[PDB]
């Protein structure tokens, strides 16, 4: 369960911000709305 500005990374088992992926290469499919 992550907010609308975060995706879940199974390696760290924690919600990672989308900003770190939006402004950097192709973000995950779930962050396309936050960019």
């Amino acid at each position, epitope marked *: 369960q992550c907010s609308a500005n975060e995706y879940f*990374d199974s390696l760290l088992h924690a919600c990672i911000p989308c900003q770190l992926r939006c402004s950097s*290469a192709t973000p995950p499919l779930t962050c396309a709305a936050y960019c």
Partner: antibody
Amino acid sequence: EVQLVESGGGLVQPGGSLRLSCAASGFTFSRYWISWVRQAPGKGLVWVGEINPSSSTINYAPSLKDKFTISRDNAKNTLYLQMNSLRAEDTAVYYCASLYYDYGDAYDYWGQGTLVTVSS
Amino acid sequence: EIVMTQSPATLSVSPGERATLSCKASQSVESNVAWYQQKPGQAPRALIYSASLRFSGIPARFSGSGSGTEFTLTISSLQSEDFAVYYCQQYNNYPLTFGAGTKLELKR
């Protein structure tokens, strides 16, 4: 200083059992996932399994379903690995490790590894 | 399982120059690849966790990229302490699988 001291582990003929301990100290062990990873002499890394904080979701490796059993004791801030019926292919340096993402940064901590030798 | 094909097996290059590793995935793991460093005698040391996102305390010279089935860690300017083994890992599908592992040596 964070630490993940690993005790237990040595020599044992095939079919035998051997429990390993991975004691932590320096970070909240009870709020992160902690996994196991073995490395056969002169070879690559192998993901054994992982376990969540509340021990409500234990993920092993298919090829090692019956051999290994993972559990943790948050009261002692220590992870466990209960190995059962091993073979020569199960000889490796078993590392424990914990990855998480607090404080806005991603971290990772490892034990010094312990050698497990399976041979007659 | 998902086989991570990591080439070259060995790379020889001098400090200050560049180094680009490659890690091909048996099947599309999306952006869920990591990168570790291990020196003889010590335990692995992670560097990348989302194919580009870096861990804490990891210099900016380590630059990872790629998605789907092809990933590459780039060590822009090398240093003496950066010569070791490097693995790639996927965690999009269980179990987590590593790569064969490239090893950097110092060309002298």
